[PDB]
Amino acid sequence: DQGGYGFAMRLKRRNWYPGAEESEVKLNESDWEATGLPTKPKELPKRQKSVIEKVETDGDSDIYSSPYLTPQPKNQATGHENFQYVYSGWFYKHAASEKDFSNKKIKSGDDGYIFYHGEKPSRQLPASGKVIYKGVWHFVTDTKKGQDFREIIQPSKKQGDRYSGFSGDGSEEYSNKNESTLKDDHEGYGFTSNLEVDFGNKKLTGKLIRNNASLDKHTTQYYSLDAQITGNRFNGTATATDKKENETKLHPFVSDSSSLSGGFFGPQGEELGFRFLSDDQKVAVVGSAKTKDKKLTTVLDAVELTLNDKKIKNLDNFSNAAQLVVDGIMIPLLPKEFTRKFEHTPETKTYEVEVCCSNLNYLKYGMLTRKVEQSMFLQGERTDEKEIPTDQNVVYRGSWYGHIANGTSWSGNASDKEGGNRAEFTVNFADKKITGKLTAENTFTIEGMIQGNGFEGTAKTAESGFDLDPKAYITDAKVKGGFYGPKAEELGGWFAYPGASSATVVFGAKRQQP
Amino acid sequence: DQGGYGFAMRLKRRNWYPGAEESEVKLNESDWEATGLPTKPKELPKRQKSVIEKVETDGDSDIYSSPYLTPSNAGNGVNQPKNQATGHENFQYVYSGWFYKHAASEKDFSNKKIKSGDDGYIFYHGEKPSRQLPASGKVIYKGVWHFVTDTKKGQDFREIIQPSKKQGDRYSGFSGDGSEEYSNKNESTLKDDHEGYGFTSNLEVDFGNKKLTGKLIRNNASLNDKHTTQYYSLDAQITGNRFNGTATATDKKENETKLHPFVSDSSSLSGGFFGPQGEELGFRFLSDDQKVAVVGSAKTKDKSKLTTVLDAVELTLNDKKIKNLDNFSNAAQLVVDGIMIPLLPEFTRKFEHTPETKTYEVEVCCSNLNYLKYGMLTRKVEQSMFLQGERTDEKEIPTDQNVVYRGSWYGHIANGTSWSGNASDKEGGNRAEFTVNFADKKITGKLTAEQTFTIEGMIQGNGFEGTAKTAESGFDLPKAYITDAKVKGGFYGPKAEELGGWFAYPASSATVVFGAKRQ
Numbered sequence A: 001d002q003g004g005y006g007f008a009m010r011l012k013r014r015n016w017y018p019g020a021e022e023s024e025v026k027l028n029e030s031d032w033e034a035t036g037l038p039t040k041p042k043e044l045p046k047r048q049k050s051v052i053e054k055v056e057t058d059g060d061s062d063i064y065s066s067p068y069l070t071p072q073p074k075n076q077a078t079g080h081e082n083f084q085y086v087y088s089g090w091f092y093k094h095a096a097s098e099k100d101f102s103n104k105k106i107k108s109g110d111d112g113y114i115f116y117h118g119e120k121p122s123r124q125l126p127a128s129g130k131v132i133y134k135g136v137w138h139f140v141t142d143t144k145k146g147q148d149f150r151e152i153i154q155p156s157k158k159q160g161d162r163y164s165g166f167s168g169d170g171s172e173e174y175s176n177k178n179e180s181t182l183k184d185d186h187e188g189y190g191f192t193s194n195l196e197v198d199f200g201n202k203k204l205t206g207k208l209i210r211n212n213a214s215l216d217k218h219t220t221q222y223y224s225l226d227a228q229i230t231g232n233r234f235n236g237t238a239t240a241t242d243k244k245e246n247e248t249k250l251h252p253f254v255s256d257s258s259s260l261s262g263g264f265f266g267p268q269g270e271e272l273g274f275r276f277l278s279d280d281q282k283v284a285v286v287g288s289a290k291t292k293d294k295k296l297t298t299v300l301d302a303v304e305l306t307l308n309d310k311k312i313k314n315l316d317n318f319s320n321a322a323q324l325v326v327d328g329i330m331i332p333l334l335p336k337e338f339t340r341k342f343e344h345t346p347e348t349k350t351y352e353v354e355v356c357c358s359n360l361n362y363l364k365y366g367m368l369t370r371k372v373e374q375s376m377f378l379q380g381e382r383t384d385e386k387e388i389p390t391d392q393n394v395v396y397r398g399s400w401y402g403h404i405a406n407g408t409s410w411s412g413n414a415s416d417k418e419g420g421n422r423a424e425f426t427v428n429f430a431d432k433k434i435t436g437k438l439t440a441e442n443t444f445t446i447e448g449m450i451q452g453n454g455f456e457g458t459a460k461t462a463e464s465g466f467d468l469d470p471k472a473y474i475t476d477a478k479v480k481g482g483f484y485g486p487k488a489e490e491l492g493g494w495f496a497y498p499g500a501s502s503a504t505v506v507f508g509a510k511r512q513q514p
Numbered sequence B: 001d002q003g004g005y006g007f008a009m010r011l012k013r014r015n016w017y018p019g020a021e022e023s024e025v026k027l028n029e030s031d032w033e034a035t036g037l038p039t040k041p042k043e044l045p046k047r048q049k050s051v052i053e054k055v056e057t058d059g060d061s062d063i064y065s066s067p068y069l070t071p072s073n074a075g076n077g078v079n080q081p082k083n084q085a086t087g088h089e090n091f092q093y094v095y096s097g098w099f100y101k102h103a104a105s106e107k108d109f110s111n112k113k114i115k116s117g118d119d120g121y122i123f124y125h126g127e128k129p130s131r132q133l134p135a136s137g138k139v140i141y142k143g144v145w146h147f148v149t150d151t152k153k154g155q156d157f158r159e160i161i162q163p164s165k166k167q168g169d170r171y172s173g174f175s176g177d178g179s180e181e182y183s184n185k186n187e188s189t190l191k192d193d194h195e196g197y198g199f200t201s202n203l204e205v206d207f208g209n210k211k212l213t214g215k216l217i218r219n220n221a222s223l224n225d226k227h228t229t230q231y232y233s234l235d236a237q238i239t240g241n242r243f244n245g246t247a248t249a250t251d252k253k254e255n256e257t258k259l260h261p262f263v264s265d266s267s268s269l270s271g272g273f274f275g276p277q278g279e280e281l282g283f284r285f286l287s288d289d290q291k292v293a294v295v296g297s298a299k300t301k302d303k304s305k306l307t308t309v310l311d312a313v314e315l316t317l318n319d320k321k322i323k324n325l326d327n328f329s330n331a332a333q334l335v336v337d338g339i340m341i342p343l344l345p346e347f348t349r350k351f352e353h354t355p356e357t358k359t360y361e362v363e364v365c366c367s368n369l370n371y372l373k374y375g376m377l378t379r380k381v382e383q384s385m386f387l388q389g390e391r392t393d394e395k396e397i398p399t400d401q402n403v404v405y406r407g408s409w410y411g412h413i414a415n416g417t418s419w420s421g422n423a424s425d426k427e428g429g430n431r432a433e434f435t436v437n438f439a440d441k442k443i444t445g446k447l448t449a450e451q452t453f454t455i456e457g458m459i460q461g462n463g464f465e466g467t468a469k470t471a472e473s474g475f476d477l478p479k480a481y482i483t484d485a486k487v488k489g490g491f492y493g494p495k496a497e498e499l500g501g502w503f504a505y506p507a508s509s510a511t512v513v514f515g516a517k518r519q
């Protein structure tokens, strides 16, 4: 979707002051909150935790949270419990009532959040095969006067009416979360998720169930899931398994959702997080799942090349070339005209960014400066390896940002004109062969082999030295890159030297046509 | 208990008018209704049926009832459910079950009343309460049982009734609800450990020790390993043709959360035996927490020395004929024409009574008798004598070889003109005396008007039989003559503190009831 490390949704409490009563408080897409990057996924998300810390109590000040979270119920899919990258769950307080009679506000009930968050969003995934993910899921409901969800939460405290139904409520007493052993057909403890991810076809399906207390089949299914995978993200729908027919509907899971979204985390996407909001705005869900406890394709490139030390770091990215993720904050690259330039301060003081180009849509590259640090960056969404064209002669044209020196330093931005930085590449896909040239003043020569949706080769200053306007002699510099966008219209790469002349360069070119 | 042909309990519907809402409606002992004696036990009880007939509907007017019941005066759909204990299904004397309508909602805003849900009854009723039972042995009875619950806001019983319509909250949970979908009542074959279809009862009656035990279970839908669920065990003492005791909720746990209503014991199990030798029975109870009422019925296997537990007879004057009366093992409760006439509000007594034959006139004796009552009964005009008593257990029959009993008798005799004489304590009026040799199984005595009769007989178990005769000589009012009068009687109360009997004849007639007390 619009990408992020995580999302949280707060419980609602309904005003029941007589004469100024809200009959209902619905959930809204706008209610979703970003969590930010967690240092430790097992801990509560910091922004929302701080909110709850300040929530007033009167008799019980503790924060209660999902049992596997960092402060004897269980909530886990057996064989799939050792999360390292992604956590979902809930936390709350027995919040004091708001009793503001002269402003006509009375509110009572728990206050808290459901959430998921993760670290290390994936840049590679299995190339093929169907893989089973299991884990947990959580929910929070709207509030409506007279409403109860007695099938899921015993309504002695007006859960669903005065404050949201949620999966952490003390009266959620129909799951097996407190039992000591499992029935033969239980998937685990409490509310659990089961997803089948088809990396071959870039899609996934799943089921969200409750494992039922034993006091006849022991689970109940509330949703099935369907989603398309794009890069490290996925988007789709949730289908309510029991909606309204012969029943008056004793639970909140009665409407489909068209807003299922999530993403993969970890080295090869072995964990995932997701959320959705029901179309009738009655229920929000978050969840997490992982491969069983213990060949790849690359879906994106996102790198930072630091000048001062010529070093190259991987950046996080949510499979969106136009969204630059640095230091856990998200910097957009298009203003909701070749190249571009601007600065940005969140909430390092400010970020200065120069980005190219206007004609590129799956690939962005340029300059990044913190304040003072300076780096180049490149990020792109790789084309599916199965979409790599077979054409034997393909020309790409564009530019590049350059920083090089054997004595004094030369720096040159990218440009469309005139004798400024220019790049050209000819690719023989059939041969798995790639070559091209970068010129400043009319010089590097690059040979490489294509592998899947990526390439790898060398860049040399040739013979001998370059200019510095003193000869810089770079030869056998490792060059890595990729093809971005559908059907590989855009391509990009970078190189650092060494692995008395230095060099750091990002470049990107666009495909032509007869 | 207090005896009767049957009992019914109505479903509750909770008021949910906002602002005037009942959060709960509990069941009460006072909610039990007498059914009266059914002409045909397979039919619905008439009083309660009439109530349900008048219950308003708006879309579906049918009365739904237990599958083995007579639809009678009422229809169905998607229907072949069963509710039966296999091998024990051919009831003739006693039926239990339920009947109901999809009642219209009461929508009376102007009286702040909103009520919705089914309206109906559970019940059992029987005919021919037993005057004899097997003398000994343990006997298996099986059958069915039914329940109705209280109503409470937010409450559901999802383990027994799928709560889509707020069963247990807006209207009573009950065993006939359309959403009782977890029993096997609709299945076509039985698992090998099912006792039958739907909710069934299993009782072991120990006639030797005058007690019984039992189990009430559900036979579960097959949707490995066991296919029934037990909700109660039962324990009761038998007294005459009645039994009383307790029900014990099988799963009350402690910690709950209790998805069914059967969570509390009951100290009010009561029922009775029906049929020639008590081969069928009916029972009811109300849970101590007033959350559930149960009724049921059971019978010996579908197709033995007997003991007599009571005598209850009517001797009609005009035709000198003798009919058995129904009785619920209670000497002080006179049951005639299906209605119950109490006999205690001073020797003898007299009074009249009209139920709801115009009125009944009764003269009853005596004040010192507690397991035996006898006197005059008149309908309006018909006239009869009656006697009824609770027999002493044959095993309690004393061995004493010389025992005197003293009392009186009511007399009606004539060879020409008629002589009638009430019973009395004094003076030369009717007086009776008996000497009994239990060891000899021998009994004799005399009735005198002041002239007399003389009775002799032998003793079989807890009853006696023999003959009575005038002096002949003759009698008074002019003389009447009696010879070889057929005499029947019994011993009543613990260790036979009491005894009584009667005779009819058969140009002289005679009809006499008598009762005496031990000295």
Ligand code: NA
Binding pocket: B004, B005, B006, B034, B035, B036, B037
């Ligand atoms: Na009755």
